[PDB]
Amino acid sequence: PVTINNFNYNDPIDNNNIIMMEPPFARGTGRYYKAFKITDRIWIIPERYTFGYKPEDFNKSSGIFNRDVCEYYDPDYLNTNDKKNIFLQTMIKLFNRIKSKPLGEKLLEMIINGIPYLGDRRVPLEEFNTNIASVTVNKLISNPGEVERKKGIFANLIIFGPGPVLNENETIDIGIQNHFASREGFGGIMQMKFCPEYVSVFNNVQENKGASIFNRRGYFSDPALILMHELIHVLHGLYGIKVDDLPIVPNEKKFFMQSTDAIQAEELYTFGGQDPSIITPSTDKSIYDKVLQNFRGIVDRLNKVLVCISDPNININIYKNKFKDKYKFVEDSEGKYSIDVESFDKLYKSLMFGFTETNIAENYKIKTRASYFSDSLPPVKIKNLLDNEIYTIEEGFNISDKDMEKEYRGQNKAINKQAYEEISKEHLAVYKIQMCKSVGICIDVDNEDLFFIADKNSFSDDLSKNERIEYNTQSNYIENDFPINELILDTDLISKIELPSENTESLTDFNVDVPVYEKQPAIKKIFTDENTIFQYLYSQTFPLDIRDISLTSSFDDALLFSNKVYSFFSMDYIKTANKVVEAGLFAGWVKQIVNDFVIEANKSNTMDKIADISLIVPYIGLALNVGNETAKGNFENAFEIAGASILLEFIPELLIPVVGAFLLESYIDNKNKIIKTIDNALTKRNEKWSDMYGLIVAQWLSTVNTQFYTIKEGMYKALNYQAQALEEIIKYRYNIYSEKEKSNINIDFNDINSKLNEGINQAIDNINNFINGCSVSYLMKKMIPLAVEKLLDFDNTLKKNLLNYIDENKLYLIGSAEYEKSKVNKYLKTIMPFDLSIYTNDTILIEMFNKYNSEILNNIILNLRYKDNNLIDLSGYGAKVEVYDGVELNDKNQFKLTSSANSKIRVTQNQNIIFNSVFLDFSVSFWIRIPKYKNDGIQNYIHNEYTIINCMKNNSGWKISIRGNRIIWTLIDINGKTKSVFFEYNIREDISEYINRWFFVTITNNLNNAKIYINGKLESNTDIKDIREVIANGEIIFKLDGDIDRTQFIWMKYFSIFNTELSQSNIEERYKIQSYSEYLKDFWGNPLMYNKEYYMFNAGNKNSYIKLKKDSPVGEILTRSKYNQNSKYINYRDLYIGEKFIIRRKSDIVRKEDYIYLDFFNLNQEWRVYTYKYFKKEEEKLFLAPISDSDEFYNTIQIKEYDEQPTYSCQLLFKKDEESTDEIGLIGIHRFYESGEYKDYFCISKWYLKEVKRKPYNLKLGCNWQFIPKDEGWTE
Ligand SMILES: [Ca+2]
Ligand SMILES: [Ca+2]
Ligand SMILES: [Zn+2]
């Protein structure tokens, strides 16, 4: 297998395994370096990498080499022989750790055997030229102090110690005359600057580094993985597939944008995971073709190679077979070398998608960062990698014997502190952006905290090019993944040809391009007066000296005053925090403010269901002020209106090209060769859909999801700053006390911090679910739909491209031309559903997606709501809403459609929303209030159906209509067949709960059933299996339509459409959510009001009402009069009878638990409704007298709501006073006794109390009342 050699730095030179090498970049001028052969073709030079740097660059200065790295400098690392030996031994241990596993051993093998082609682009096809700096490197055989003799050798990898920045490991290829053999199929000598002790630190905002705001967070990297990551780069460069292509370039137009270097796809491929997804499928192929093209040139070179002038010793045939093995070329029974497409795809996918930091980390059970695009914390120093107590060849730091395996605990900074030491910041250099106000007042910001947003130029416009379709044309796809299991069990991948002699002729042509580096300014000062997220987080910090601080809700005050710390929590929380108390109450206050912190923090779990938003973190706007000034006004409201988009610091300009046109080829007389050109144009069409989605996905990840990542972090920093500030205040107050006082103070700083930490972790989980949801929200509604638009345009242009073609082939297509005609129309009849897991297999991304799709609220494609005297669509799809003057609207979300021509609403749906995924799957919900028939017009009521909401496209669509006491749903397939379901309430009931009363309607449609729900209960079901296609995304017209009587009107509310069938459970919950209110309601369902005339109704005694007895001060219970007229089709009990009551306030709208005075009119006077007080009887008549302080009777009343389910009923209860839980009784009706038919009265009663507590709540109780005002919808 793979043998790892052992040596000691001081071992003698032998010119074989221990040499004095002359590195490629020394150009063969001056001293050499002692090098050790760790394995075949791989060398170790335990010294600082100085090629291209200046001695001073090794010292820490006010400069930096890389902008997005927290650089560590130490010019003393490797400055002694013992340091050099340690480096050597550590490299040996790391290589042993790499091969301890099959996967890593293979990596080493491919690399060892992936010898560089002998030559590069400049070399003639017929020759092998080893005399090039990328192939041969010299070793000094000559005695000490002289270069009398230099011998050449072939090598694959040369690993040096670090360059100026210890933690900046890098793999370098050799460029000669501006070209790179390692990027053009040849391969060449690879170099690496590497440091094993100073490893990077990372952590997940989603996860929780042992969860502790006060304890160190993050994980440190296993250097073996870091080395394998560099070895992958090395592998690519050896196989010469390290090609350059369209890079991911950061947008740097805005001050808040992260500045960084261009990122090649080879870099993201190397990391693996979700990163390859940032590289569009278009570019994945561009790189694929390039590599394949480089290989083509190589295989041709093998078929032509004849001699080697540079080294007479080279055995042509020996090498031809070694390279054939290296590139997996095929040899026919002729000696002809060929590229077997299948074996090429395998090798390519193995090298680009098999060997990735992510796949290796997983196999080795090593933890690593979530993405190349994730915050880079400060590095740490591993105490001693050579100490098996700390680091083993088999497990790294995650040693199970030390119970350090479970959960990568061994890499956990807070857990395995005996493994590392922190680093002296005085020696750290970091690129900072200084943001100055032009007043001024500057804030230093790490370039890591900025928003990384990919520029539009990063993406491939290739989708706009034309496609030549032939009977041959085929589908092109590249799976950005590769089963790691088979790569490990893959036999014929391994080298099957021995490694040739590494000894060759000396290199005399030292021509080579040596990279020159120079530090760049570590701080760039820019001018801005914007007070965005940076400024906001800043206002939450305080100087290390200032010890007496106080919180403040004023951002500006906090900026100016150093002892003032901004807080985005409640005014209450803030005042309590600045509160100063006596030592004897300090404990109680600490306990209060802490528990309060937790409460405030946990408001991150707020629900906004009524607004169709399950989760909202209301304080994010106040905390960061990111996006469109989210710290002003009410964030919840603003979000309900604009959604995720408001949180984005910048709205990216997407690249969504017009998909180029297809040019079909003619194959006259050849029926088949013509059919294929159709079937193929179809499949190539599917390719364009998928490729467009990938283009969207790649953009979503690098321009949008990056910003939301930045917001999640910002919020983590924000919660910490708040906890830190609180503790600072708490500690400051405590130390004001005397030691004698402190002694008698009950304080546990480990309880405090624990609770504060527990509150943050919970908030972080909410914030993360919320932000991820927003991210996915933006993708699905603000990005995908736009791609769908173009894709349909194309799908269309292509439809009339194939039809024409079929036309011109009528003669050749004969008796089937008409058959394909359909083939084309039907194949293009369904749009490809977007599925994220097609472009990524990342676990987190997939879960974000599956979760978003599991929330029913995300299927809402229409949600008409009120906003500034007008209706608008808040589904996020931007439906067009045209409301005409005839429509009445109010802020209670109700709108009225009259008989007027101008009372209508026009909705133009979004054409890009997947709806007719074929099989019919959707629902519609809304609240409606339909007035009672005109007693003198019942004939036109019963007969005569008028449409209220119409939605048709080319004579097909759906319709909601009404025929009196019946609401109707109607479907019309693309042909003309029609099926309908309906609900119909009765018009002969004494008291109807539908007529003129608000009620919930939901209509759902799945493959074979259209159902109608009323208040969450199923009322009717219609089998609609027949029905063919049904166009439904046409315009929706809200207008009363048909033979309608001028006085006809309809109230509607909360109109919503879902692109899916709602379950009975969803419906019932929507019913409950939309029924909830803090105010009570009247008989009709409207908000209950104070100072409003109302007749009373009793849910228990339907036909009973209240009349003030001619004699005494009590309320009789007469019987409701009734339909006196003579129509046998209608009947009811007069509602506007009995006393005319009016609700009065105690201490506008009538809310629960409110205290009131139930008065009522009597001629001109306004009397009240009192109780006795001492009725030692369970129940007894109430007292209706004028407005006097009859201290003999109770007056005040507390209206309540005991029913947990929706209802327009309310209760009226008396209390000893607005304080004493001591109750008196609830208002109702009870029959007593009187014989010359007894007599029921306005009986109050305690018997109720026990009853109300009953579940399910009792609807028919006598304490259940309802208020009825004259309404135009009800005439008697
Ligand atoms: Ca990709
Ligand atoms: Ca301050
Ligand atoms: Zn890399």
UniProtKB/Swiss-Prot annotation:
<keyword id="KW-0446">Lipid-binding</keyword>
<keyword id="KW-0964">Secreted</keyword>
<feature type="binding site">
    <location>
        <begin position="1229"/>
        <end position="1230"/>
    </location>
    <ligand>
        <name>D-galactose</name>
    </ligand>
</feature>
<keyword id="KW-1015">Disulfide bond</keyword>
<feature type="active site">
    <location>
        <position position="230"/>
    </location>
</feature>
<comment type="similarity">
    <text>Belongs to the peptidase M27 family.</text>
</comment>
<dbReference type="GO" id="GO:0006508">
    <property type="term" value="P:proteolysis"/>
</dbReference>
<keyword id="KW-0528">Neurotoxin</keyword>
<keyword id="KW-0482">Metalloprotease</keyword>
<dbReference type="GO" id="GO:0090729">
    <property type="term" value="F:toxin activity"/>
</dbReference>
<feature type="region of interest" description="Translocation domain (TD)">
    <location>
        <begin position="440"/>
        <end position="853"/>
    </location>
</feature>
<dbReference type="InterPro" id="IPR000395">
    <property type="entry name" value="Bot/tetX_LC"/>
</dbReference>
<feature type="region of interest" description="C-terminus of receptor binding domain (C-RBD)">
    <location>
        <begin position="1076"/>
        <end position="1276"/>
    </location>
</feature>
<keyword id="KW-0862">Zinc</keyword>
<dbReference type="GO" id="GO:0005576">
    <property type="term" value="C:extracellular region"/>
</dbReference>
<dbReference type="Pfam" id="PF07953">
    <property type="entry name" value="Toxin_R_bind_N"/>
</dbReference>
<feature type="disulfide bond" description="Interchain (between light and heavy chains)">
    <location>
        <begin position="436"/>
        <end position="442"/>
    </location>
</feature>
<dbReference type="GO" id="GO:0020002">
    <property type="term" value="C:host cell plasma membrane"/>
</dbReference>
<dbReference type="Pfam" id="PF07952">
    <property type="entry name" value="Toxin_trans"/>
</dbReference>
<comment type="subunit">
    <text>Heterodimer; disulfide-linked heterodimer of a light chain (LC) and a heavy chain (HC). At pH 4.4 in the presence of ganglioside GT1b may form trimers. Interacts with host receptor synaptotagmin-1 (SYT1); interaction is improved in the presence of gangliosides. Interacts with host receptor synaptotagmin-2 (SYT2). SYT2 interaction and toxin uptake do not require gangliosides but are improved in their presence. HC interacts with a complex including at least host synaptic vesicle glycoprotein 2 (SV2) and synaptotagmin-1 (SYT1); copurification does not depend on glycosylation of either protein.</text>
</comment>
<dbReference type="GO" id="GO:0044161">
    <property type="term" value="C:host cell cytoplasmic vesicle"/>
</dbReference>
<feature type="binding site">
    <location>
        <position position="267"/>
    </location>
    <ligand>
        <name>Zn(2+)</name>
    </ligand>
</feature>
<keyword id="KW-0645">Protease</keyword>
<dbReference type="GO" id="GO:0008289">
    <property type="term" value="F:lipid binding"/>
</dbReference>
<protein>
    <recommendedName>
        <fullName>Botulinum neurotoxin type B</fullName>
        <ecNumber>3.4.24.69</ecNumber>
    </recommendedName>
</protein>
<feature type="binding site">
    <location>
        <position position="233"/>
    </location>
    <ligand>
        <name>Zn(2+)</name>
    </ligand>
</feature>
<keyword id="KW-1036">Host cytoplasmic vesicle</keyword>
<keyword id="KW-1051">Host synapse</keyword>
<dbReference type="GO" id="GO:0016020">
    <property type="term" value="C:membrane"/>
</dbReference>
<dbReference type="InterPro" id="IPR013104">
    <property type="entry name" value="Toxin_rcpt-bd_C"/>
</dbReference>
<dbReference type="InterPro" id="IPR012928">
    <property type="entry name" value="Toxin_rcpt-bd_N"/>
</dbReference>
<feature type="binding site">
    <location>
        <position position="229"/>
    </location>
    <ligand>
        <name>Zn(2+)</name>
    </ligand>
</feature>
<dbReference type="InterPro" id="IPR036248">
    <property type="entry name" value="Clostridium_toxin_transloc"/>
</dbReference>
<feature type="short sequence motif" description="Host ganglioside-binding motif">
    <location>
        <begin position="1245"/>
        <end position="1248"/>
    </location>
</feature>
<dbReference type="GO" id="GO:0008320">
    <property type="term" value="F:protein transmembrane transporter activity"/>
</dbReference>
<keyword id="KW-1032">Host cell membrane</keyword>
<dbReference type="InterPro" id="IPR011065">
    <property type="entry name" value="Kunitz_inhibitor_STI-like_sf"/>
</dbReference>
<keyword id="KW-0378">Hydrolase</keyword>
<dbReference type="Pfam" id="PF07951">
    <property type="entry name" value="Toxin_R_bind_C"/>
</dbReference>
<keyword id="KW-0812">Transmembrane</keyword>
<feature type="region of interest" description="Belt; not required for channel formation">
    <location>
        <begin position="477"/>
        <end position="528"/>
    </location>
</feature>
<keyword id="KW-0582">Pharmaceutical</keyword>
